[PDB]
Amino acid sequence: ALLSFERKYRVPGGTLVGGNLFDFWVGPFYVGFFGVATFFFAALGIILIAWSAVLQGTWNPQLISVYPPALEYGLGGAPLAKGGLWQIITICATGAFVSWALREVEICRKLGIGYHIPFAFAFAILAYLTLVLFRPVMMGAWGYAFPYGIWTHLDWVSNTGYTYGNFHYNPAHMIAISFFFTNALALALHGALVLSAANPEKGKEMRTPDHEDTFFRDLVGYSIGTLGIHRLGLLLSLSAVFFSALCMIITGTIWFDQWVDWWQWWVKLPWWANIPGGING
Amino acid sequence: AEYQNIFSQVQVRGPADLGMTEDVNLANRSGVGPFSTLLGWFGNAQLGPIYLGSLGVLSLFSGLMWFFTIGIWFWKQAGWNPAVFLRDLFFFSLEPPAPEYGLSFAAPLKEGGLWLIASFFMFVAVWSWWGRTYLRAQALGMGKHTAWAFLSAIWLWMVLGFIRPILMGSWSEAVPYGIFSHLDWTNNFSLVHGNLFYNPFHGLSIAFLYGSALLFAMHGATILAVSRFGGERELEQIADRGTAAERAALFWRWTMGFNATMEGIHRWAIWMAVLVTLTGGIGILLSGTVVDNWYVWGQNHG
Amino acid sequence: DLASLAIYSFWIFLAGLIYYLQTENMREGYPLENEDGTPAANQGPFPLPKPKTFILPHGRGTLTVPGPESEDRPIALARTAVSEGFPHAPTGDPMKDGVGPASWVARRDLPELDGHGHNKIKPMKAAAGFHVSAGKNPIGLPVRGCDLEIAGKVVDIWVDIPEQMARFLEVELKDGSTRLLPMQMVKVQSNRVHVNALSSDLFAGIPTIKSPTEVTLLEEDKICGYVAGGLMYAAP
Numbered sequence A: 001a002l003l004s005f006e007r008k009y010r011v012p013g014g015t016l017v018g019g020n021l022f023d024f025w026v027g028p029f030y031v032g033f034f035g036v037a038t039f040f041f042a043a044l045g046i047i048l049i050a051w052s053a054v055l056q057g058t059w060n061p062q063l064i065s066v067y068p069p070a071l072e073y074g075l076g077g078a079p080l081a082k083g084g085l086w087q088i089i090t091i092c093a094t095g096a097f098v099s100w101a102l103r104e105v106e107i108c109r110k111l112g113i114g115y116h117i118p119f120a121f122a123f124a125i126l127a128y129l130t131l132v133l134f135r136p137v138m139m140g141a142w143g144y145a146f147p148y149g150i151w152t153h154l155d156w157v158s159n160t161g162y163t164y165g166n167f168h169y170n171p172a173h174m175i176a177i178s179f180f181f182t183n184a185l186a187l188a189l190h191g192a193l194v195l196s197a198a199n200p201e202k203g204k205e206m207r208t209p210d211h212e213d214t215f216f217r218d219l220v221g222y223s224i225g226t227l228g229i230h231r232l233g234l235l236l237s238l239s240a241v242f243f244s245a246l247c248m249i250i251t252g253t254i255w256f257d258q259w260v261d262w263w264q265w266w267v268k269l270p271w272w273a274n275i276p277g278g279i280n281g
Numbered sequence B: 001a002e003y004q005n006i007f008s009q010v011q012v013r014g015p016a017d018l019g020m021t022e023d024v025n026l027a028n029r030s031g032v033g034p035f036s037t038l039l040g041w042f043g044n045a046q047l048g049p050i051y052l053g054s055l056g057v058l059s060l061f062s063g064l065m066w067f068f069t070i071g072i073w074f075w076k077q078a079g080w081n082p083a084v085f086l087r088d089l090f091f092f093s094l095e096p097p098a099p100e101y102g103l104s105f106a107a108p109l110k111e112g113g114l115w116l117i118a119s120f121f122m123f124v125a126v127w128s129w130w131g132r133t134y135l136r137a138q139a140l141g142m143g144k145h146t147a148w149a150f151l152s153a154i155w156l157w158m159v160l161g162f163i164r165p166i167l168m169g170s171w172s173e174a175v176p177y178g179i180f181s182h183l184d185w186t187n188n189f190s191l192v193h194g195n196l197f198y199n200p201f202h203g204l205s206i207a208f209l210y211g212s213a214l215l216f217a218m219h220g221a222t223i224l225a226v227s228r229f230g231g232e233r234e235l236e237q238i239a240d241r242g243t244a245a246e247r248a249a250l251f252w253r254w255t256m257g258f259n260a261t262m263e264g265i266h267r268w269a270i271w272m273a274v275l276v277t278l279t280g281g282i283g284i285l286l287s288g289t290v291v292d293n294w295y296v297w298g299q300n301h302g
Numbered sequence C: 001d002l003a004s005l006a007i008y009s010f011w012i013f014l015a016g017l018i019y020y021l022q023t024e025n026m027r028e029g030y031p032l033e034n035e036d037g038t039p040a041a042n043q044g045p046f047p048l049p050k051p052k053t054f055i056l057p058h059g060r061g062t063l064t065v066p067g068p069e070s071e072d073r074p075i076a077l078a079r080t081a082v083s084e085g086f087p088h089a090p091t092g093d094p095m096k097d098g099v100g101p102a103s104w105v106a107r108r109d110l111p112e113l114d115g116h117g118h119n120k121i122k123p124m125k126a127a128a129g130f131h132v133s134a135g136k137n138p139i140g141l142p143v144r145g146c147d148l149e150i151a152g153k154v155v156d157i158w159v160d161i162p163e164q165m166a167r168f169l170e171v172e173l174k175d176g177s178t179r180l181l182p183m184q185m186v187k188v189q190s191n192r193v194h195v196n197a198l199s200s201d202l203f204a205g206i207p208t209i210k211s212p213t214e215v216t217l218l219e220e221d222k223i224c225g226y227v228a229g230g231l232m233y234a235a236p
Ligand code: BCL
Pocket: A097, A124, A125, A126, A127, A128, A130, A131, A156, A157, A158, A160, A161, A162, A166, A167, A168, A173, A176, A177, A180, A241, A243, A244, A245, A247, A248, B186, B187
C-alpha cells in the first residue's frame, strides 16, 4: 500500500473542488474530484470506441479506426456511423486530459511542491488540440483532423505531409526537429553524467558534482550546472512541442502550397536574384 | 507570482574554478576564460578552462579539415562568387562516388573522390573524439557511461555512411554532405524501401524519441518543482535521501501508481534516449540489405 | 528472416531491460507498508534487488541500499476513517510537528562538502572572493510576508561555493536573531524581499541553526519543510 516514508505526507487538504468528498487514495492512486471526472470520460470514450468497433465489423486492434466526419459536414454535427462517434470521443479525450492535469494540481498542492509538471503537461494537450480542434476549425471541416487508429493515423500523417511535397521543407518543422534531436542528446548526457559520478570506477569514491562540472570543461570547455541542465531539458522539451503545434497551425491555413517553394523568397532577393551560375540560374 | 526558478533573481560570482585534479595532466588544461552574466542567468557563468591535450587536437584539427574540405567544394560550385554562395547556400552539396566506382577509392575529385576525403577526416575526428570522452572520464575516476552512450549515436552514424554502403556494394548508398541535399536523401530512402513507417524498428525509434521528450519534460519539471528542498543536488539525495526525493517520488506514485528513485530515474533517462539511435541503427541496416519493401514484408514477415 | 528474427530478440531484450529498471527503482521506500507501519501483504510482481554499497567520499563512511527503513522521528498524525486510503489528520501543530507539506527527513546532521572536503555552503561574508555580480542585491533589504507586514531584514546571502549559487538569505528578526530562507521561496524586488508562504508571526518559528557559519543536511530539511508548509498552513 504505502512506501516506507509515505504516511507523514497523506494529510487532508489541497483539493480545488468538493472539499474532502473525494479527498482520498485508492491503492497508490490519489483520487480527488478530478480523478472521478477523468474516470467518467475515460470509461465513456472507451465504450464508444467499442461501439465503433462493431459498426466497422471487427474487434481487431490493428484495424479498428474511428474516422472523423467527411468534409461535407464542414464544422457541423454528423451521424454516429459517419463521423459522429469521432466527435464525441474527441470530446471525452479532451475531458479526460484536462481533468488529469487538474488532478496533478491537487496532488501538487497537497505535497507543497511547484506546478511545473501539470504546467508542462498542458503543452502536450495543446499539440493535441491543434491537430484535432484548432487546425480543423480554421479549415472549416472536422475532416482535416486525424483518425483514431494505430496505422490509419500514421496514414493521415504520411498523406497530410505529402500534400505539400517533402514536408521537410516546413521551416517550423525544421526548428522542431532540432529541439527533439537536441532534447535527446541532452537527456542522454544528463543521465550518463549523474550516473558516471555516482557509479565511479569499481572501488573508487562516489564522485561529487565538482567532478561533474570538471568533466564538461575538460571536454567542451563549459558546464551548465546541475540546476541549469534541469532547466535546459524542460525548455528543449516544451520548445520542440511548441514549434510542432506552430508548424502545423500554419500548414493549410496561412500557407497551402508546396513547402519547398516557400524558400524562393530567399533566392529571389534582388542582390543575388539575377546573378548567373550557382545552383539557381 | 510565486518564483518559478527558470531564471536566477540574483547572480553571485567568486574566483575561477580550475576544477578537480585527480590523475589529470594539468599541463593540458587551458586558461580560465571569461565569465558571462548572460549564461549565468540560466546556468553556469564560468567559461573554461578546457582540457585540450593530444587527442583533442587531432579531432579538433581532423574536424576542421572535414568542414573545410566541404566549404571549398561549395565555393567551387558557388563559382567563387560570394553572392551565389550565400544565396544557394542550402542548395550546394558534395555527393559520393557514382555507382560505377562501387567501393573503390579510385573515383576522381569531381566524381566522389572529394567526398571520400572529407569522409575520411570525419571518420577520424569523431572516433578520436570518442576516445577523448572515455579518457576524460578515466582521468577523474568516473564511470564510462558517457562513452557508451555516445557510442549508440556513433552506431547509427556508422551505419548510414560506412556499414550499409559496404553491405550494399557502393559508396553511392551513403549520405551526401549538404543541407537540403541530405533531407531529400531521407525522403528518398523511405520511398525506395516501401515507406519506412512499415519498418518496425523505425516506428520503435520514433517511440523512444517521443519518450525522451516526455521523460526529460517530466524529470525537468519535477526537479524544479522540488528545488525548494534543494532537489537539483541529485548526487547527495542519492547518498542521503531528503524530502525533495520523497515528495518527488510521491507525486508520481499518487498520479500513476508507480515511481522511481533519485538514482533510478537517470537510469530510465539514459536508456530511453540511447535506444533511439540503437533501434534506428538496426532498422536502417536491414533496409536494402535484407528487406526491400517494408510494406511487402509487413504482409508476410518472411 | 533476419528482420522477423531481429524483432523478437529485441522485445525479449526490452522486457529484460524494463525488469532490471523497475527493480533498481525499488532500492528505496520498499518493502511496502500498511497504514500501521507493518509489512503489507502484496508487494507487486517485482522482487527487491540485491543491495549495493556506496563509498561516500571524505571517509564519510558507506551506504547500502536497499536497507533498513526508519523514519527515526515521531509522526503526529491520526486516522480519520476506519478503513484504508484516507487522510490522517495532524494531532498537533502541522508546522511544528513537521508533517504534511511541512514534512522533513531525518538526514545526516553534517554539512555537504565540496570535492575538497570544505563546506559546500557558507554565508557570503565567510566566502573570500564572492560578491553579487548581477541582479538586485538583497543584503540590507527588509523582508515582508504573507500578511504584508515587516518580519526582518536580509543581512547576508549564504552561497554554494562549488556551484556559485545563492541558496539561502540570512534574515535578522526583531529580537535580533537570524533565520535562513530558501532562495527558491522568496521574491526579490527593488526595495523589498517578499515571502508568500509565511506571515510575519510564523517567521520566528523557522527552525534555527547551531553553528552561525554552516548548515547541516538535517537543518536544511527542517528549514525548507517548514517554509513550504506555510503555503497550506499559514492560511489563517
Ligand atoms: C512523410 C510525412 C512528413 C512528415 C509529416 C508530419 C506531419 C503531417 C506532422 C508531423 C509532426 C511532427 N514531425 Mg514529421 N514528417 C516527416 C518527417 C519527420 C522527421 C525525419 C527525421 O524525417 C522528423 C524527426 C519528424 C518529426 C516530427 C515531430 C517534430 C512532430 C511530431 C511530434 C509532436 O508534435 O508531438 C506532439 C504530441 C501530441 C500531439 C500528443 C499529445 C498527447 C496527449 C496530450 C495525451 C495522449 C494520452 C493517451 C491517449 C493516454 C494513454 C494512456 C494509457 C494508460 C497508456 N518528421 C515527413 C517528411 N510530421 C506533427 C506535428 O507537428 O504535430 C503538431 C504533425 O502533425
